[PDB]
Write a protein that binds this ligand. Structure first.
Ligand SMILES: NC(=O)C1=CN([C@@H]2O[C@H](COP(=O)(O)OP(=O)(O)OC[C@H]3O[C@@H](n4cnc5c(N)ncnc54)[C@H](O)[C@@H]3O)[C@@H](O)[C@H]2O)C=CC1
Ligand SMILES: NC(=O)C1=CN([C@@H]2O[C@H](COP(=O)(O)OP(=O)(O)OC[C@H]3O[C@@H](n4cnc5c(N)ncnc54)[C@H](O)[C@@H]3O)[C@@H](O)[C@H]2O)C=CC1
Ligand SMILES: NC(=O)C1=CN([C@@H]2O[C@H](COP(=O)(O)OP(=O)(O)OC[C@H]3O[C@@H](n4cnc5c(N)ncnc54)[C@H](O)[C@@H]3O)[C@@H](O)[C@H]2O)C=CC1
Ligand SMILES: NC(=O)C1=CN([C@@H]2O[C@H](COP(=O)(O)OP(=O)(O)OC[C@H]3O[C@@H](n4cnc5c(N)ncnc54)[C@H](O)[C@@H]3O)[C@@H](O)[C@H]2O)C=CC1
Ligand SMILES: O=C1O[C@]2(CCc3ccccc32)CC(O)=C1Sc1ccccc1Cl
Lengths: 327, 328, 324, 331
């Protein structure tokens, strides 16, 4: 017999559906950062990568595979064909077209019209995590095309924005970001909302201590912290050409909550119809409880009139683009 | 009174000297893969990054800082000046020209090291140096020569990755996790490495004993191709994606783990091998080394076949021929 | 509207089942060591504890629950009733007393195993209770499970102790010290000298007296120290707990994560080494999501084979008289 | 030539002083749960255990050591002699006196002082720059005692205080709200035990204040009786004691979380016991739990929580009581 048969006696060839599988779609900088972070946090028992550039895809797969001795994810697969993604619990979408606003979103619609039905065909029960920008519109697109219930379509939304905010808050106060609490909500990008009323260390509200916090009268101009959050991508892109590591870590944190059913609260993009006077089918970031069935619950943050008006404006602008899209 | 001062009462401002600081020199694809892997393994209380391309260096630093909420490394710094590297326990050198002859690669990397190593030694006189830049066996010798450090504190990444690839391919053939598939690739990193067939085993069961033709031309199952693929796999990845990063980053982070936590695990890394295998020259090659907080404290003396010994000797001869002409 | 409703808008409520549930049966020193080790390795989304002492059981559950902020296991439950164990992927049996011992632990298993099978029909069973090789056989017979899903902790800890002791002698971390103790867990275990190595260098080839009474360094006494270790620890602190907990958690990891790592655990060895009886002994097994999918056929000396066969004859002698 | 020397060539015979060493004093149920948790979190390159019962001590060491293959802490040592503790970064004290029934509270504390008169000077002799983490009860008073005996600056003397109390509170809150305790924020401060103070104003999920949504929160007229959450926090230990005989696992995990912040210099905020003179009208040398920034120098900073009048009066009454006991102690 073979050396394998001389060395190993088989009790059963009988294999099983992979039980904790993750797919990442897109193997650019963002997708590969998501992949390595997922691998180093031992979240999946099988990882699949899909992209349309076949050589790059195979090379990235192989490079990860060659690290297998130092990982605990025993199977890594890839291919242009979505059959490699079958029975994924979670599918992370990072592919898309990069930038006209309506035309750009329509180009990503046409891309998602190929990707999403493929994903659904092979993992009809998966959760979808949309990272591709503009994430709030593209989470809607994914939801529309998939037919999935709202709970199973999640946008990375303001998760990273909020992490950057807490990083920056930590530097100002000299405290680890883990102990600096603060939420950036709404539309990911220039119109996101820093919720001053919820910023705290050890349950001590900064706004109560410093009533002018986040206003034009603030002697310390904490508004600049939010400006830095919305500028951060630009600044990093100007310096290294793209952003990758921070988004990969933040996405892995979201995957952890879903795959381990933790029901931690994260600021991610979900369908907000019914809240803040919004009546259109639009997705925006609010704090959501994340777990095994995706977004089961959301936190009803108390917002001021101005903060609600900002979320409503974003919603109006997003709906205006969305009604003009062709599915 | 500022918000910070209303919120927080300071007890003292004293000291602040990093206890488990790691520096990565060179923030190319390799250096950054090393950095992310080290960060996600919680090996350091401070990570410093150094490079000559200041915009890229700053951008990478910022990108890592922006993920601090998800990490347990509270301080990440960078700069072109080596003062950012002060008091490092471990300095990882992943700086150099990225290749694509091998002699011209030596030429330029020796010049870069002539600048880098004195600066590293100035600010971290007590560090361990881990050399990844290629050709790693030569550049490990070079870093040793320049630094003046004792042998134990100058470590080349050597065949650690070659071995990890071998174990992955073995595990694929056998349907066993690479952790349970043992085998060692030693000697000169890359094209001339040597697989030690006699040590290949699962659960202490020697494959060579079961299958006497293993590694020879008579082998009907062509296990020699597994080592051949360790070489061919690498060039294949370069053809497909243009470089390799993740596997080398993970391998380097494993070495950093053994050193930082003083584990005294055995790794095939590149060390000063004068006194073994008839080798009488100051050559660095990979053998199994015990790694801990003093770097390479001991090495294992592997019994090699005549053929295996002759391949290590030929490498040592070649390397010394190159090294003996170097001008410091 | 309650405070909860004021704070949280529900999208949907239907209850889900755990994806990675582990049950630990018996909350003595061993059970709880396994449970804390399993919790700190983030292997489970639900942990179930079962025992017959209701006060102690509730107390241990609560004590773990109070640490939840520091863990990644969102639900910990306990109960005398096996309904709390339903849908388990892995069930670890540590219940029983620390001829006489076997019979007492068999009667316990006549109650435990059917209840386990009833609520988690597709689980892997990991038997830790002693004598582990016999009670693994008992679990298999009673359960009706195929043999890949009935696993004894076996010599996994014996081999871990051996590698610790080898590592102390050589000044090398046990991770890089390789050596296997096989066969019957306890007094009659077999140290496989031919497989002992560092970096693939055979100690036996380097030191031909290795394992014999002629050995001036008395490496044979390293195996004796393994056999006597539990006795020495039990003498000092009254029981052993931590090492077994950590070794059980390592097995759990390989199973839950489908790693296909090789571990020396107790499996049906009929058909190997001339053994004809339905006896379980430790050999290196590939462990994954179907339990033991494969085993490594270690090449043993004629002496080593005779030892395994003698253990098999002795175990069957006990097993044949057992009343199910 | 020994087998070892035939197999291994030695470049240098070692040995560095330990670099990330932790000592646990007391190998009872609490000390050992601290030890296992510290080991499974890879916080130390060397762990020392010290206690006076030599047999039990040796047995616990050997049992841990037999799990070495599964750990990443290469040196585990123990001894009755404190020379095994030399050069520890962090020394965790869990040793103490068991209460006798009917005993005055002063009397119990004094018996613990008598134990600390042996332990603390031994700790200081062999690790004079360490951080001391006091776990032994009553923790707030015994942290004061360790401070006085050691002569250490206050930043290096830390009581485990209300770290566990707050974690229980967040566990209970999370069960009520259907949210992981990591995302349920709330602080129990002051004196560990029956007189702790639940700071209702800081209780929140995602920055949304429960007190602002539900003004009755924590009061007697609250129809959801949220004050019972804090009642369960204060009675948790008693109920676990009654049920299983003692508590261990929760305190082990909480101490390991404190050790992580100190050893990795994280500057995370924890409610631990610190010398609080000069706050809340407290004018005595007493230790109470407030949110503290923990790192490699121990407590570098504290958070100044805005308290209500009744909250402030509760801390002051604790300080007065603690002080009244402390000024009677014989050092
Ligand atoms: N919402 C958020 O928080 C953030 C989102 N992103 C998103 O992640 C995306 C990825 O950016 P990078 O990785 O830097 O780009 P990149 O240029 O490094 O790589 C993107 C990859 O996507 C692939 N791709 C394009 N269309 C595809 C299709 N139909 N199917 C499969 N693969 C396809 C390309 O072949 C390319 O390799 C960005 O376009 C952005 O939209 C990035 C950062 C933050
Ligand atoms: N031995 C091994 O297993 C492996 C070795 N390598 C080696 O690592 C090195 C880097 O590879 P890549 O990251 O792809 O190269 P890269 O071109 O992607 O980046 C290398 C970095 O070195 C920097 N650098 C140049 N001179 C410097 C100086 N004086 N100080 C500090 N930084 C300086 C460059 O600015 C650049 O950012 C190469 O020598 C490569 O052969 C790479 C993979 C595996
Ligand atoms: N195979 C191995 O490597 C090792 C095995 N062990 C074995 O583990 C077993 C338990 O050891 P310890 O935890 O120290 O004993 P212990 O007495 O501390 O705990 C045993 C528990 O089993 C419970 N129990 C009894 N009947 C039960 C039933 N019908 N259902 C559920 N629970 C029941 C008891 O109430 C008790 O809580 C013993 O057989 C011991 O020999 C111990 C160490 C290593
Ligand atoms: N602050 C907190 O949250 C908690 C504190 N604790 C405290 O931890 C301590 C230990 O509790 P357990 O481990 O359950 O009690 P235990 O009695 O089981 O263990 C305490 C150990 O202290 C030792 N000891 C006594 N005098 C000593 C000396 N001079 N040197 C060294 N060791 C000495 C004993 O030999 C014993 O092994 C108690 O004092 C208790 O008050 C316990 C639970 C929670
Ligand atoms: O896999 C690798 O990537 C290498 C090959 C050349 C190159 C260029 C950019 C980044 C990385 C790499 C460096 C290396 O040494 C290795 S390892 C190797 C190389 C050649 C033959 C065998 C091996 Cl194991």
């Amino acid at each position: 017999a073979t050396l394998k048969d001389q060395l190993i006696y088989n009790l059963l060839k009988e294999e099983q559906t992979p039980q904790n599988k993750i797919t990442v779609v897109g193997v650019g900088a963002v997708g590969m950062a998501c992949a390595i972070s997922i691998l180093m946090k031992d979240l999946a028992d099988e990882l699949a990568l899909v992209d349309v550039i076949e050589d790059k895809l195979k090379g990235e797969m192989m490079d990860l595979q060659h690290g297998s001795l130092f990982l605990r994810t025993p199977k890594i697969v890839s291919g242009k064909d979505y059959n490699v993604t079958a029975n994924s619990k979670l599918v992370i979408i990072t592919a898309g077209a990069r930038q006209s606003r309506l035309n750009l979103v329509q180009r990503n619609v046409n891309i998602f019209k190929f990707i999403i039905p493929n994903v659904v065909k092979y993992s009809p029960n998966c959760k979808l995590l949309i990272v591709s920008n503009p994430v709030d519109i593209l989470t809607y697109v994914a939801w529309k095309i998939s037919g999935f219930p709202k709970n199973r379509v999640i946008g990375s939304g303001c998760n990273l924005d909020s992490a950057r905010f807490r990083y920056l808050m930590g530097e100002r106060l000299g405290v680890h970001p883990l102990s600096c609490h603060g939420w950036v909500l709404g539309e990911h990008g220039d119109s996101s909302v820093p919720v001053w009323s919820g910023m705290n260390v050890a349950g001590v509200s900064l706004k109560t201590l410093h009533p002018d916090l986040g206003t034009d009268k603030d002697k310390e101009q904490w508004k600049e912290v939010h400006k830095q959050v919305v500028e951060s991508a630009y600044e990093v892109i100007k310096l290294k050409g793209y952003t990758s590591w921070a988004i990969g870590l933040s996405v892995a944190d979201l995957a952890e909550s879903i795959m381990k059913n933790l029901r931690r609260v994260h600021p991610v993009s979900t369908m907000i119809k019914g809240l803040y006077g919004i009546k259109d089918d639009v997705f925006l970031s609010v704090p959501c409880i994340l777990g095994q069935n995706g977004i089961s619950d959301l936190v009803k943050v108390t917002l001021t009139s101005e903060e609600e008006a900002r979320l409503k404006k974003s919603a109006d602008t997003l709906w205006g683009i969305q009604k003009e899209l062709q599915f």
